């Protein structure tokens, strides 16, 4: 009758309680009932399926309250300080004309309201009309470690090809696809601003993801493996730099993985980030 499904550390039956977190790679929109100039926020936590565990999150903000005019749209970018308008980003993605921008954002020519609310963004997008001036604009706005302009325009382009939207892919040439997806997010933001769709619910259980031993030990074993590789390479550089003999017993250590897995599955912490994950098994009865 022993159901199993637990671990044994130091003679103690430890159980990894299922954790709960939110999902990613889904466009979300929310309202702001505060006196902040932002009325609606279009958040989207982008991350790859396996590896690195990305935390970068894109945000498309809509400025200007209801009733007042000149309601522009500005979306933030990672590693870039101030926010950048959506149309300027469209110029940095290779799309120069504005009719194509309105063709990517709004997919219905009959609707005049969304296109009407696009006007101020088409004005600021009239101020900056070139793709090269847009790449130099994002190069001059955020990340000032490039110093040289010739390396900050190509560096900004590499940001738009790699860090910008980590999902889908990170190769060069996928700017058209990301332009269509960006216009889709703007279509969801403005479409939520026209009171045609309610605020995105976060209590929907389908948008929630649980984590058992699989994901937890994936993060843990991932970080521990990275530390192991880094330490092994440290021993390599010490060996070639100090000019001595090499040994396989001093390069690859086992107490990093043993102490990491044994310590994480032994204590409540999973490294305070996370606590209370591992609990002693309650043997009061069978239903307990």
């Amino acid at each position: 009758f022993d159901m199993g499904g637990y671990f044994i550390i130091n003679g103690s039956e430890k159980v990894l309680i299922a954790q709960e977190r939110s999902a990613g790679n889904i466009v979300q929109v929310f309202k702001k009932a505060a006196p902040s100039p932002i009325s609606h926020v279009a958040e989207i936590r982008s991350a790859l399926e396996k590896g690195s565990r990305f935390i970068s999150t894109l945000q498309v903000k809509l400025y200007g309250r209801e009733g007042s005019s000149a309601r522009t749209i500005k979306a933030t970018l990672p590693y870039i300080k101030q926010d950048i308008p959506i149309v300027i980003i469209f110029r940095a993605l290779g799309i120069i004309p504005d009719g194509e921008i309105l063709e990517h954002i709004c997919y219905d020519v009959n609707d005049w309201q969304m296109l009407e609310m696009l006007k101020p963004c088409v004005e600021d997008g009239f101020v900056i009309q070139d793709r090269e001036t847009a790449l130099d604009f994002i190069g001059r706005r955020g990340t000032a470690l490039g110093i040289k302009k010739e390396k900050r325009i190509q560096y900004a382009k590499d940001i738009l090809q790699k860090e910008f939207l980590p999902h889908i892919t990170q190769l060069e040439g996928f700017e058209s696809r990301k332009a269509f997806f960006l216009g889709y997010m703007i279509n969801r933001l403005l479409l939520c601003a026209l009171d045609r769709k309610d605020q995105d619910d976060r209590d929907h259980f389908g948008k929630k993801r649980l984590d058992l031993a699989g994901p937890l030990l994936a993060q843990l074993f991932k970080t521990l493996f990275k530390k192991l590789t880094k330490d092994i390479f440290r021993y390599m550089q010490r060996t070639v730099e100090e000019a001595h003999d090499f040994n396989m017993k001093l390069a690859i250590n086992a107490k990093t993985i043993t102490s990491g897995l044994k310590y994480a599955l032994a204590t409540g912490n999973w490294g305070s980030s996370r606590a209370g994950v591992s609990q002693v098994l309650n043997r009061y009865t069978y239903s307990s």
Partner: protein, 72 residues
């Protein structure tokens, strides 16, 4: 006949055929087994290659990479 509609009580049988297959605590066993099967090879293979760059004055290099992991 064999093509007759089922009843309410009959459904219980189905539930039995469920718990005989899964068990009351099958999610932890399936997730952990999938972790041991695929997650180990994925983590080992996703970032196994590390190289040391050696300089001399002729350039030199060294490399260490991890392959198929083995569990006991």
């Amino acid at each position: 006949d064999e093509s007759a509609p089922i009843t309410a009580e009959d459904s219980w049988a189905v539930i039995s055929a469920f718990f005989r297959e899964k068990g009351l605590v099958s999610q932890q066993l399936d997730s952990f087994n999938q972790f041991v099967d695929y997650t180990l090879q994925d983590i080992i293979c996703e970032d196994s290659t590390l190289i040391l760059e050696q300089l001399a004055q002729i350039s030199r290099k060294y490399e260490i990479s991890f392959g198929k992991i083995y569990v006991t």
